[PDB]
Write a protein that binds this ligand. Sequence first.
Ligand SMILES: N[C@@H](CCC(=O)N[C@@H](CS)C(=O)NCC(=O)O)C(=O)O
Length: 105
Amino acid sequence: AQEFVNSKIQPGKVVVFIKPTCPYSRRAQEILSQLPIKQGLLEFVDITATNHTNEIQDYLQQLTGARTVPRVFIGKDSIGGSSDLVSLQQSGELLTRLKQIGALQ
Ligand SMILES: N[C@@H](CCC(=O)N[C@@H](CS)C(=O)NCC(=O)O)C(=O)O
Protein backbone atom coordinates (compact mmCIF):
# COMPACT_ATOMS: atom_id res chain seq x y z
CA ALA A 1 0.00 0.00 0.00
CA GLN A 2 2.26 2.84 -1.21
CA GLU A 3 0.78 4.84 -4.11
CA PHE A 4 -2.55 4.08 -2.39
CA VAL A 5 -2.51 6.73 0.37
CA ASN A 6 0.29 8.82 -1.19
CA SER A 7 -1.94 9.36 -4.26
CA LYS A 8 -4.76 10.65 -2.03
CA ILE A 9 -2.97 12.82 0.57
CA GLN A 10 -1.68 16.05 -0.96
CA PRO A 11 -1.00 19.63 0.22
CA GLY A 12 -4.20 21.59 0.92
CA LYS A 13 -6.28 18.38 0.95
CA VAL A 14 -7.87 16.58 3.92
CA VAL A 15 -8.33 12.79 3.85
CA VAL A 16 -9.43 10.45 6.66
CA PHE A 17 -8.66 6.70 6.88
CA ILE A 18 -11.44 4.87 8.78
CA LYS A 19 -13.00 1.44 9.26
CA PRO A 20 -16.81 1.57 9.19
CA THR A 21 -17.19 -0.42 12.43
CA CYS A 22 -15.39 1.43 15.25
CA PRO A 23 -17.23 4.51 16.66
CA TYR A 24 -13.92 6.46 16.91
CA SER A 25 -13.52 6.60 13.13
CA ARG A 26 -17.15 7.70 12.96
CA ARG A 27 -16.31 10.53 15.38
CA ALA A 28 -13.84 11.85 12.79
CA GLN A 29 -16.61 11.62 10.20
CA GLU A 30 -19.01 13.46 12.52
CA ILE A 31 -16.63 16.37 13.30
CA LEU A 32 -15.00 17.14 9.95
CA SER A 33 -18.54 16.74 8.61
CA GLN A 34 -19.39 20.04 10.36
CA LEU A 35 -16.18 21.76 9.19
CA PRO A 36 -16.71 24.22 6.30
CA ILE A 37 -14.07 22.54 4.13
CA LYS A 38 -13.66 23.59 0.48
CA GLN A 39 -15.40 21.55 -2.24
CA GLY A 40 -14.25 17.94 -2.74
CA LEU A 41 -11.35 18.57 -0.34
CA LEU A 42 -12.65 16.52 2.58
CA GLU A 43 -13.06 12.76 2.12
CA PHE A 44 -13.42 9.54 4.15
CA VAL A 45 -11.21 6.60 3.13
CA ASP A 46 -12.59 3.22 4.24
CA ILE A 47 -9.48 0.99 4.10
CA THR A 48 -11.97 -1.92 4.20
CA ALA A 49 -13.80 -1.22 0.92
CA THR A 50 -10.45 -1.67 -0.88
CA ASN A 51 -8.98 -4.90 0.52
CA HIS A 52 -5.32 -5.04 1.66
CA THR A 53 -6.70 -3.47 4.85
CA ASN A 54 -3.54 -4.41 6.80
CA GLU A 55 -1.33 -3.07 3.98
CA ILE A 56 -2.66 0.49 4.37
CA GLN A 57 -2.51 0.55 8.18
CA ASP A 58 0.87 -1.12 7.88
CA TYR A 59 1.65 1.88 5.67
CA LEU A 60 -0.05 4.45 7.95
CA GLN A 61 2.24 3.02 10.62
CA GLN A 62 5.48 3.69 8.69
CA LEU A 63 4.05 6.91 7.20
CA THR A 64 3.08 8.38 10.59
CA GLY A 65 3.68 5.82 13.36
CA ALA A 66 0.32 4.73 14.85
CA ARG A 67 -2.01 2.29 13.05
CA THR A 68 -5.12 3.23 15.08
CA VAL A 69 -8.52 4.30 13.64
CA PRO A 70 -9.06 6.87 12.45
CA ARG A 71 -5.92 8.28 10.80
CA VAL A 72 -6.42 11.90 9.61
CA PHE A 73 -4.08 13.83 7.28
CA ILE A 74 -4.38 17.62 6.97
CA GLY A 75 -2.38 18.11 3.78
CA LYS A 76 0.51 15.60 3.84
CA ASP A 77 0.96 16.37 7.57
CA SER A 78 -0.64 13.74 9.86
CA ILE A 79 -2.30 15.11 13.04
CA GLY A 80 -2.97 11.75 14.75
CA GLY A 81 -6.07 9.59 15.32
CA SER A 82 -9.53 10.70 16.51
CA SER A 83 -8.67 11.73 20.06
CA ASP A 84 -5.82 13.61 18.37
CA LEU A 85 -8.03 15.55 15.93
CA VAL A 86 -10.48 16.75 18.61
CA SER A 87 -7.63 17.85 20.91
CA LEU A 88 -6.70 20.17 18.01
CA GLN A 89 -10.25 21.31 17.09
CA GLN A 90 -11.14 22.55 20.59
CA SER A 91 -7.61 23.97 20.76
CA GLY A 92 -8.09 25.75 17.41
CA GLU A 93 -4.69 24.50 16.20
CA LEU A 94 -6.64 22.28 13.77
CA LEU A 95 -8.31 24.96 11.63
CA THR A 96 -4.90 26.61 11.75
CA ARG A 97 -3.28 23.60 10.05
CA LEU A 98 -6.09 23.90 7.50
CA LYS A 99 -5.48 27.66 7.16
CA GLN A 100 -1.70 27.58 6.51
CA ILE A 101 -2.46 25.27 3.54
CA GLY A 102 -5.86 26.80 2.72
CA ALA A 103 -7.95 23.62 3.13
CA LEU A 104 -10.87 25.63 4.56
CA GLN A 105 -13.16 28.04 2.68
N1 LIG B 1 -8.47 6.64 20.08
C1 LIG B 1 -7.55 6.23 18.97
C2 LIG B 1 -8.38 5.66 17.82
C3 LIG B 1 -9.30 4.55 18.34
C4 LIG B 1 -9.11 3.26 17.53
O1 LIG B 1 -9.07 3.28 16.32
N2 LIG B 1 -9.08 2.14 18.20
C5 LIG B 1 -9.11 0.84 17.47
C6 LIG B 1 -10.38 0.79 16.61
S1 LIG B 1 -11.64 1.85 17.35
C7 LIG B 1 -7.88 0.67 16.58
O2 LIG B 1 -7.47 1.59 15.90
N3 LIG B 1 -7.50 -0.56 16.33
C8 LIG B 1 -6.49 -0.85 15.28
C9 LIG B 1 -6.64 -2.30 14.82
O3 LIG B 1 -7.70 -2.86 15.04
O4 LIG B 1 -5.72 -2.81 14.21
C10 LIG B 1 -6.77 7.45 18.48
O5 LIG B 1 -7.31 8.54 18.53
O6 LIG B 1 -5.63 7.27 18.06
